[PDB]
């Protein structure tokens, strides 16, 4: 048996969806990845 606050967990989900990412930045990360892997 393990106690963990579920209200806090879904609260973390909301804050993650609400927050949006700059497309221009989102692409810089993708580029960097492809390069960093190849």
């Amino acid at each position: 048996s393990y106690y963990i606050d579920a209200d806090l967990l879904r609260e973390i989900k909301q804050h993650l969806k609400q927050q949006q990412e700059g497309l221009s930045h989102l692409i810089s990360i993708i580029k960097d990845d492809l390069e960093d892997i190849k």
Binding site: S1, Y2, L9, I12, K13, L16, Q19, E21, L26
Partner: protein, 85 residues
């Protein structure tokens, strides 16, 4: 170390290693400010859901380990009453 005991110790170590890696990967991301900038908020949403799925597994194993050590004590107690009084 029978099969039941061996499979648990092994299945319990693989989840332990996963959890260890996932946490360190997340802590490092949230460690420095420049580090968070190298990941999107939806990467966290992943990591979070991944670490939790592992946590649930670990918690299940630790629980079953508790159950095993419990029967160990009971059997051990059974034998003692038989051969030691």
């Amino acid at each position: 170390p029978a099969d039941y005991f061996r499979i648990l110790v092994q299945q319990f170590e693989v989840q332990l290693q996963q959890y260890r890696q996932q946490i360190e990967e997340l802590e490092n991301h949230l460690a420095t400010q420049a580090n968070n900038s190298h990941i999107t908020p939806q990467d966290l949403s992943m990591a979070m859901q991944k670490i939790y799925q592992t946590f649930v597994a670990l918690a299940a194993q630790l629980q079953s380990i508790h159950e095993n050590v419990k029967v160990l004590k009971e059997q051990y107690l059974g034998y003692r009453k038989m051969f030691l009084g």
